Amino acid sequence: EGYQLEQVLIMSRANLRAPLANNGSVLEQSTPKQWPEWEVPGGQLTTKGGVLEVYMGHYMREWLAQQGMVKTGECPAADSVYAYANSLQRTVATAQFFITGAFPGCDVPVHHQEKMGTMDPTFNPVITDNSPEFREKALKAMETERQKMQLTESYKLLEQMTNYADSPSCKEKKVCSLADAKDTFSADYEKEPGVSGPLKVGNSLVDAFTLQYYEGFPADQVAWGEIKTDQQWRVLSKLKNGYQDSLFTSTEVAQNVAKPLVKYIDKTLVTEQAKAPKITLLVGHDSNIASLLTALDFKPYQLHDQQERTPIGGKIVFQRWHDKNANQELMKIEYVYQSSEQLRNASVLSLQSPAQRVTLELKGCPVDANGFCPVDKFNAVMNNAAK
Amino acid sequence: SPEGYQLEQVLIMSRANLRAPLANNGSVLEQSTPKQWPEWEVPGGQLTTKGGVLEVYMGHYMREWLAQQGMVKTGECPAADSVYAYANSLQRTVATAQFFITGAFPGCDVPVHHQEKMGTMDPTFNPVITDNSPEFREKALKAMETERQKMQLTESYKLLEQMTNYADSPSCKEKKVCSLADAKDTFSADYEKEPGVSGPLKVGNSLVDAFTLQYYEGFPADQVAWGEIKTDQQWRVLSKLKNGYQDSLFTSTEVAQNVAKPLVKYIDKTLVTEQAKAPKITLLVGHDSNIASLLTALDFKPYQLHDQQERTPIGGKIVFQRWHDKNANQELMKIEYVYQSSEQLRNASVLSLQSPAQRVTLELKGCPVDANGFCPVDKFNAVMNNAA
Ligand SMILES: O=P(O)(O)O[C@H]1[C@H](OP(=O)(O)O)[C@@H](OP(=O)(O)O)[C@H](OP(=O)(O)O)[C@H](OP(=O)(O)O)[C@H]1OP(=O)(O)O
Ligand SMILES: O=P(O)(O)O[C@H]1[C@H](OP(=O)(O)O)[C@@H](OP(=O)(O)O)[C@H](OP(=O)(O)O)[C@H](OP(=O)(O)O)[C@H]1OP(=O)(O)O
Ligand SMILES: [Ca+2]
């Protein structure tokens, strides 16, 4: 009956979490205005984020079955499914909710490293090369990417929405402007690429608004009611997307930082394939998706009906399709995600009312008219990035 | 909780949440009407995805309550082994435990225990006759007929026949069984089987269970009972068949005492006799019949659940609570039925302390409560030991 979906690996970020807005946090320091309250402490998933993942899980399960992988109504064979999350509350949580929605009533544990509350090396996008040539070249690549962006409109808008000149940052630390302030990038050995300055603050702020919107806060409680149009979202989102792009998206940085994740995905889909599950779920972070995508050299992609480049509840679904011979196998990779509205509305997902799907393309594995490329070339892409 | 009251242990005896109509009633449903039954997203008897979300909300609600009461701290996981979750080995009950525990302790490592051999009944949750003596039966068969005789179901059956066009069903056109009221019931109490009824009472229960479930699942109005049920009173009259079935089978003391013994024994260990070594929080997930027979077996006072047509609601829990009154140096028991209203299920309403689940305080005949719903622990232990 032709090509059947034989193996999938799903790379996920955590779903909806509470912004961190307690005394002394970046959010609190960045405005004199009070933030609306959330149901859990900062950085913890919300219940709506779990329900959104349950819906994604159920949709995915339907879809997996539709493509021949394991049929609806029965648990998959033991050890058919392997769920591995970074060792943080929100990523373990998003895995539990996804796996429960997709595989209800089945014994599929979520795995994670022993120490909760700390970064697992698999998911920790840290710089591994201590040479000053790597650092100089990384810094120059971040600065170059940043220098292409026109952010002052975004910043002026944000200063007005937050009353930034009256915030604790301004009054106590004399950091009083977003639009005129200087970014400082870092590419420190054994840390994440970073930036300090307005871009980091604009990132934290716009992220908080995005989350309020998705969480379903009334319009008057999103950003104090100040974001009234998609156009405004678009202007503001330039900061959050520009932060991620600057840091995680240069070729120098990404290939280094995402090595343990690339290696994990190579092992699962290529080099230790005999033992691999039919379904792997990894749950990490936006920086992991951003650097992975750069490190495997995907072509440019655009996500319709989303303001985020790496959306809350958005997953990279790598798919190995098999008919009769392993050397005729095909690979197809899609970004499967909920639109900004499907998130805010908690939309019930189904085959008739699906998640959004965009097919992604590796530069090294050109796809046909239907998004498939030969496994032969996929394998070469992975080997080469995993070197 | 009053001043100086501190909650210290809870046991949550839950029904599964929202499931598709039982596959075992499929052919009765088919014989009872010429109409087409709306299709469900899962095989009969399995939890639906909505059941899952609804149970995630009950978990988060119970979490917020437990943190209000100082039983668990906001923003961290409970101590290892302090939460013990044990489900019957069926898809729906294990699924409901997983969704409850994920909604309540998201991000925490809290396993759902069940016997292996999923798809088979775990004896703890198996509401079966466990006495093969012919003298058990006669007291039982009679106690069931006695409960059944207190109910007036004729109007329910005429309503059901009207709504289903039962006149044109296979049952009537082919088998010439052309009235549910004129037909008779025959109870059974067969060794290692659930107490049972043959006849129009089982037909009524099967159909009206399906309608109730359609309504919860959010089928559109024209697809719950083919749009035939217009009035909350019509719901109430139909629900008599389903509540009547359960009450006849699981609610006479002589049946309920036998059939609930394993769960009664379990709850007695956890709350009374092995209490010291017992998890602070226990979730058991079983079946409506478990709740029904448990509550008779412990001699509860009669209760009414507001905003529900079911006597043991979908997702509904019996919540046993040991409290220390520090001021008067006493240990008290409070027991409440906590559950979603028919509208909270159909709407998938988010639940929190600000928009809470329904709660009704229950009362042991052996353990009379004060003005606030609390009774003494020693009186509770007697009831429990005596019952076990
Ligand atoms: O640890 P990372 O892999 O870098 O990613 C997460 C987080 O991603 P999710 O939002 O996917 O969980 C980021 O979120 P953005 O602000 O970039 O949207 C970021 O920021 P926060 O500190 O605001 O969470 C933060 O990066 P870093 O690890 O450098 O702090 C980090 O959170 P954790 O520190 O908890 O991992
Ligand atoms: O067999 P149980 O252990 O009681 O559990 C369920 C179900 O209960 P829940 O909806 O609470 O989980 C019952 O049916 P309802 O009381 O819910 O209508 C039940 O018995 P009935 O069909 O007599 O009601 C049926 O067991 P069986 O069909 O063998 O009698 C069974 O479900 P399964 O059909 O999935 O075993
Ligand atoms: Ca600029």
mmCIF file of N, CA and C in Angstrom, chain A residues 37-114:
data_model
loop_
_atom_site.group_PDB
_atom_site.id
_atom_site.type_symbol
_atom_site.label_atom_id
_atom_site.label_comp_id
_atom_site.label_asym_id
_atom_site.label_seq_id
_atom_site.Cartn_x
_atom_site.Cartn_y
_atom_site.Cartn_z
ATOM 1 N N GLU A 37 -1.760 38.792 37.457
ATOM 2 C CA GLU A 37 -1.312 37.623 38.121
ATOM 3 C C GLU A 37 -1.543 36.341 37.294
ATOM 4 N N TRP A 38 -0.657 35.363 37.461
ATOM 5 C CA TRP A 38 -0.814 34.088 36.747
ATOM 6 C C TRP A 38 -1.078 32.998 37.783
ATOM 7 N N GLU A 39 -1.545 31.852 37.312
ATOM 8 C CA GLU A 39 -1.941 30.773 38.197
ATOM 9 C C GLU A 39 -0.778 30.029 38.854
ATOM 10 N N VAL A 40 0.462 30.218 38.377
ATOM 11 C CA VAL A 40 1.588 29.479 38.909
ATOM 12 C C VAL A 40 2.743 30.448 38.921
ATOM 13 N N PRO A 41 3.805 30.118 39.687
ATOM 14 C CA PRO A 41 5.042 30.906 39.716
ATOM 15 C C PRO A 41 5.735 30.993 38.372
ATOM 16 N N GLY A 42 6.571 32.006 38.206
ATOM 17 C CA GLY A 42 7.211 32.277 36.918
ATOM 18 C C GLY A 42 7.964 31.064 36.402
ATOM 19 N N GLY A 43 7.816 30.740 35.115
ATOM 20 C CA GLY A 43 8.571 29.676 34.466
ATOM 21 C C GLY A 43 7.889 28.318 34.543
ATOM 22 N N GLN A 44 6.774 28.248 35.274
ATOM 23 C CA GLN A 44 6.035 27.009 35.356
ATOM 24 C C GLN A 44 4.937 26.971 34.298
ATOM 25 N N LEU A 45 4.707 25.800 33.698
ATOM 26 C CA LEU A 45 3.580 25.650 32.774
ATOM 27 C C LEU A 45 2.282 26.009 33.447
ATOM 28 N N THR A 46 1.348 26.467 32.607
ATOM 29 C CA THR A 46 0.020 26.666 33.070
ATOM 30 C C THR A 46 -0.810 25.493 32.631
ATOM 31 N N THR A 47 -1.968 25.432 33.237
ATOM 32 C CA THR A 47 -2.938 24.382 32.956
ATOM 33 C C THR A 47 -3.394 24.520 31.508
ATOM 34 N N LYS A 48 -3.598 25.745 31.039
ATOM 35 C CA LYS A 48 -3.996 25.915 29.647
ATOM 36 C C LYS A 48 -2.877 25.437 28.723
ATOM 37 N N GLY A 49 -1.623 25.630 29.108
ATOM 38 C CA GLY A 49 -0.524 25.126 28.271
ATOM 39 C C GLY A 49 -0.603 23.612 28.209
ATOM 40 N N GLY A 50 -1.038 22.985 29.304
ATOM 41 C CA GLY A 50 -1.136 21.481 29.207
ATOM 42 C C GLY A 50 -2.288 21.066 28.327
ATOM 43 N N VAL A 51 -3.415 21.742 28.479
ATOM 44 C CA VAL A 51 -4.604 21.409 27.665
ATOM 45 C C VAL A 51 -4.243 21.621 26.143
ATOM 46 N N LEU A 52 -3.586 22.755 25.812
ATOM 47 C CA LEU A 52 -3.097 22.967 24.448
ATOM 48 C C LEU A 52 -2.220 21.812 23.968
ATOM 49 N N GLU A 53 -1.366 21.308 24.861
ATOM 50 C CA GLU A 53 -0.534 20.154 24.466
ATOM 51 C C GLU A 53 -1.356 18.901 24.341
ATOM 52 N N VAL A 54 -2.353 18.727 25.197
ATOM 53 C CA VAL A 54 -3.231 17.543 25.048
ATOM 54 C C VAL A 54 -3.860 17.555 23.669
ATOM 55 N N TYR A 55 -4.392 18.702 23.282
ATOM 56 C CA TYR A 55 -4.972 18.821 21.936
ATOM 57 C C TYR A 55 -3.999 18.527 20.803
ATOM 58 N N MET A 56 -2.742 19.015 20.928
ATOM 59 C CA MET A 56 -1.695 18.749 19.954
ATOM 60 C C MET A 56 -1.395 17.234 19.895
ATOM 61 N N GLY A 57 -1.328 16.614 21.067
ATOM 62 C CA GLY A 57 -1.107 15.201 21.190
ATOM 63 C C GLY A 57 -2.156 14.370 20.515
ATOM 64 N N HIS A 58 -3.418 14.716 20.770
ATOM 65 C CA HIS A 58 -4.528 13.984 20.184
ATOM 66 C C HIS A 58 -4.534 14.114 18.641
ATOM 67 N N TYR A 59 -4.375 15.352 18.168
ATOM 68 C CA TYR A 59 -4.202 15.660 16.733
ATOM 69 C C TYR A 59 -3.075 14.852 16.163
ATOM 70 N N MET A 60 -1.911 14.861 16.839
ATOM 71 C CA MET A 60 -0.772 14.102 16.323
ATOM 72 C C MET A 60 -1.047 12.598 16.253
ATOM 73 N N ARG A 61 -1.669 12.042 17.300
ATOM 74 C CA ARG A 61 -2.043 10.645 17.331
ATOM 75 C C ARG A 61 -2.952 10.220 16.162
ATOM 76 N N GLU A 62 -4.012 10.993 15.914
ATOM 77 C CA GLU A 62 -4.886 10.872 14.733
ATOM 78 C C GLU A 62 -4.096 10.884 13.433
ATOM 79 N N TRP A 63 -3.185 11.857 13.342
ATOM 80 C CA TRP A 63 -2.437 12.042 12.138
ATOM 81 C C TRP A 63 -1.482 10.864 11.945
ATOM 82 N N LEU A 64 -0.834 10.411 13.029
ATOM 83 C CA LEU A 64 0.112 9.271 12.975
ATOM 84 C C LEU A 64 -0.534 7.999 12.488
ATOM 85 N N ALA A 65 -1.752 7.784 12.978
ATOM 86 C CA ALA A 65 -2.586 6.670 12.599
ATOM 87 C C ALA A 65 -3.050 6.763 11.101
ATOM 88 N N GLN A 66 -3.533 7.933 10.702
ATOM 89 C CA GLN A 66 -3.862 8.230 9.306
ATOM 90 C C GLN A 66 -2.727 7.853 8.308
ATOM 91 N N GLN A 67 -1.473 8.113 8.681
ATOM 92 C CA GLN A 67 -0.321 7.790 7.867
ATOM 93 C C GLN A 67 0.265 6.379 8.092
ATOM 94 N N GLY A 68 -0.443 5.541 8.851
ATOM 95 C CA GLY A 68 -0.126 4.113 8.986
ATOM 96 C C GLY A 68 0.775 3.712 10.140
ATOM 97 N N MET A 69 0.907 4.568 11.138
ATOM 98 C CA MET A 69 1.949 4.277 12.081
ATOM 99 C C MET A 69 1.579 3.405 13.243
ATOM 100 N N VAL A 70 0.438 3.669 13.852
ATOM 101 C CA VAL A 70 -0.059 2.843 14.950
ATOM 102 C C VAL A 70 -1.508 3.252 15.151
ATOM 103 N N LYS A 71 -2.430 2.320 15.089
ATOM 104 C CA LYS A 71 -3.810 2.723 14.875
ATOM 105 C C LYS A 71 -4.536 3.135 16.143
ATOM 106 N N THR A 72 -5.553 3.980 15.951
ATOM 107 C CA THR A 72 -6.294 4.642 17.037
ATOM 108 C C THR A 72 -7.031 3.547 17.779
ATOM 109 N N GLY A 73 -7.176 3.666 19.089
ATOM 110 C CA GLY A 73 -7.948 2.642 19.773
ATOM 111 C C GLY A 73 -7.112 1.648 20.527
ATOM 112 N N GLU A 74 -5.820 1.556 20.227
ATOM 113 C CA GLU A 74 -4.946 0.607 20.966
ATOM 114 C C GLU A 74 -3.649 1.291 21.431
ATOM 115 N N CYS A 75 -3.030 0.811 22.504
ATOM 116 C CA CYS A 75 -1.763 1.397 22.914
ATOM 117 C C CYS A 75 -0.696 0.899 21.908
ATOM 118 N N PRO A 76 0.337 1.721 21.609
ATOM 119 C CA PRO A 76 1.448 1.274 20.741
ATOM 120 C C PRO A 76 2.195 0.157 21.438
ATOM 121 N N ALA A 77 2.993 -0.623 20.706
ATOM 122 C CA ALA A 77 3.701 -1.736 21.390
ATOM 123 C C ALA A 77 4.588 -1.155 22.457
ATOM 124 N N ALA A 78 4.839 -1.927 23.508
ATOM 125 C CA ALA A 78 5.743 -1.458 24.541
ATOM 126 C C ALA A 78 7.050 -0.941 23.936
ATOM 127 N N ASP A 79 7.499 0.187 24.470
ATOM 128 C CA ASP A 79 8.785 0.809 24.133
ATOM 129 C C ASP A 79 8.814 1.334 22.713
ATOM 130 N N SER A 80 7.632 1.446 22.092
ATOM 131 C CA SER A 80 7.462 1.996 20.741
ATOM 132 C C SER A 80 7.653 3.491 20.803
ATOM 133 N N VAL A 81 7.461 4.068 21.993
ATOM 134 C CA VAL A 81 7.414 5.539 22.147
ATOM 135 C C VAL A 81 8.469 5.950 23.200
ATOM 136 N N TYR A 82 9.300 6.929 22.914
ATOM 137 C CA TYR A 82 10.248 7.356 23.917
ATOM 138 C C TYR A 82 10.117 8.856 24.082
ATOM 139 N N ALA A 83 9.785 9.296 25.282
ATOM 140 C CA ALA A 83 9.579 10.757 25.492
ATOM 141 C C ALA A 83 10.748 11.207 26.362
ATOM 142 N N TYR A 84 11.490 12.198 25.900
ATOM 143 C CA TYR A 84 12.649 12.713 26.646
ATOM 144 C C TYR A 84 12.558 14.234 26.715
ATOM 145 N N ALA A 85 12.505 14.779 27.914
ATOM 146 C CA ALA A 85 12.348 16.237 28.144
ATOM 147 C C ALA A 85 13.573 16.763 28.911
ATOM 148 N N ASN A 86 13.999 17.985 28.591
ATOM 149 C CA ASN A 86 14.873 18.717 29.497
ATOM 150 C C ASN A 86 14.369 18.667 30.956
ATOM 151 N N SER A 87 15.302 18.671 31.917
ATOM 152 C CA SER A 87 14.967 18.495 33.315
ATOM 153 C C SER A 87 14.528 19.789 34.023
ATOM 154 N N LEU A 88 13.451 20.377 33.490
ATOM 155 C CA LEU A 88 12.809 21.610 34.035
ATOM 156 C C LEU A 88 11.314 21.334 34.142
ATOM 157 N N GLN A 89 10.658 22.002 35.072
ATOM 158 C CA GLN A 89 9.260 21.739 35.302
ATOM 159 C C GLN A 89 8.502 21.874 34.000
ATOM 160 N N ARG A 90 8.813 22.882 33.179
ATOM 161 C CA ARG A 90 7.827 23.181 32.119
ATOM 162 C C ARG A 90 8.016 22.228 30.964
ATOM 163 N N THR A 91 9.249 21.761 30.781
ATOM 164 C CA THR A 91 9.454 20.848 29.656
ATOM 165 C C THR A 91 9.012 19.424 30.003
ATOM 166 N N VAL A 92 9.281 18.988 31.255
ATOM 167 C CA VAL A 92 8.717 17.691 31.708
ATOM 168 C C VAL A 92 7.194 17.763 31.668
ATOM 169 N N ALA A 93 6.616 18.864 32.196
ATOM 170 C CA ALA A 93 5.192 19.012 32.127
ATOM 171 C C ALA A 93 4.675 18.923 30.691
ATOM 172 N N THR A 94 5.287 19.674 29.771
ATOM 173 C CA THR A 94 4.669 19.696 28.417
ATOM 174 C C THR A 94 4.770 18.292 27.816
ATOM 175 N N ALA A 95 5.865 17.593 28.090
ATOM 176 C CA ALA A 95 5.900 16.179 27.631
ATOM 177 C C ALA A 95 4.780 15.285 28.212
ATOM 178 N N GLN A 96 4.560 15.347 29.531
ATOM 179 C CA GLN A 96 3.461 14.576 30.188
ATOM 180 C C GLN A 96 2.123 14.859 29.567
ATOM 181 N N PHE A 97 1.854 16.113 29.275
ATOM 182 C CA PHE A 97 0.518 16.445 28.794
ATOM 183 C C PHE A 97 0.424 15.960 27.341
ATOM 184 N N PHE A 98 1.481 16.168 26.558
ATOM 185 C CA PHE A 98 1.454 15.726 25.162
ATOM 186 C C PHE A 98 1.276 14.190 25.077
ATOM 187 N N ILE A 99 2.050 13.450 25.873
ATOM 188 C CA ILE A 99 2.018 12.009 25.821
ATOM 189 C C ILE A 99 0.738 11.435 26.380
ATOM 190 N N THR A 100 0.233 12.001 27.464
ATOM 191 C CA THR A 100 -1.086 11.620 27.912
ATOM 192 C C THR A 100 -2.205 11.891 26.827
ATOM 193 N N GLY A 101 -2.155 13.013 26.095
ATOM 194 C CA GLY A 101 -3.231 13.346 25.103
ATOM 195 C C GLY A 101 -3.131 12.377 23.908
ATOM 196 N N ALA A 102 -1.900 12.064 23.545
ATOM 197 C CA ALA A 102 -1.613 11.247 22.348
ATOM 198 C C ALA A 102 -1.738 9.767 22.630
ATOM 199 N N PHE A 103 -1.272 9.367 23.817
ATOM 200 C CA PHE A 103 -1.278 7.970 24.225
ATOM 201 C C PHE A 103 -2.010 7.719 25.554
ATOM 202 N N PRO A 104 -3.296 8.124 25.654
ATOM 203 C CA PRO A 104 -3.986 8.006 26.924
ATOM 204 C C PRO A 104 -4.186 6.604 27.407
ATOM 205 N N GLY A 105 -3.816 6.337 28.651
ATOM 206 C CA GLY A 105 -4.092 5.031 29.174
ATOM 207 C C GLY A 105 -2.956 4.074 28.810
ATOM 208 N N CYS A 106 -1.930 4.555 28.136
ATOM 209 C CA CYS A 106 -0.768 3.688 27.804
ATOM 210 C C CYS A 106 0.391 3.936 28.776
ATOM 211 N N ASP A 107 1.244 2.938 28.992
ATOM 212 C CA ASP A 107 2.403 3.218 29.863
ATOM 213 C C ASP A 107 3.574 3.759 29.064
ATOM 214 N N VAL A 108 3.615 5.090 28.956
ATOM 215 C CA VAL A 108 4.708 5.762 28.260
ATOM 216 C C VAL A 108 5.300 6.798 29.212
ATOM 217 N N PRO A 109 6.406 6.454 29.918
ATOM 218 C CA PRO A 109 6.901 7.408 30.901
ATOM 219 C C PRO A 109 7.601 8.608 30.267
ATOM 220 N N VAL A 110 7.607 9.763 30.940
ATOM 221 C CA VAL A 110 8.449 10.809 30.417
ATOM 222 C C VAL A 110 9.859 10.654 31.054
ATOM 223 N N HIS A 111 10.932 10.571 30.262
ATOM 224 C CA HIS A 111 12.274 10.493 30.835
ATOM 225 C C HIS A 111 12.957 11.860 30.922
ATOM 226 N N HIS A 112 13.872 12.023 31.876
ATOM 227 C CA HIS A 112 14.605 13.262 32.004
ATOM 228 C C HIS A 112 15.798 12.943 32.907
ATOM 229 N N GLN A 113 16.830 13.779 32.907
ATOM 230 C CA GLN A 113 17.977 13.525 33.790
ATOM 231 C C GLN A 113 17.584 13.667 35.265
ATOM 232 N N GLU A 114 18.410 13.070 36.113
ATOM 233 C CA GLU A 114 18.056 12.868 37.476
ATOM 234 C C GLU A 114 17.798 14.203 38.183
#
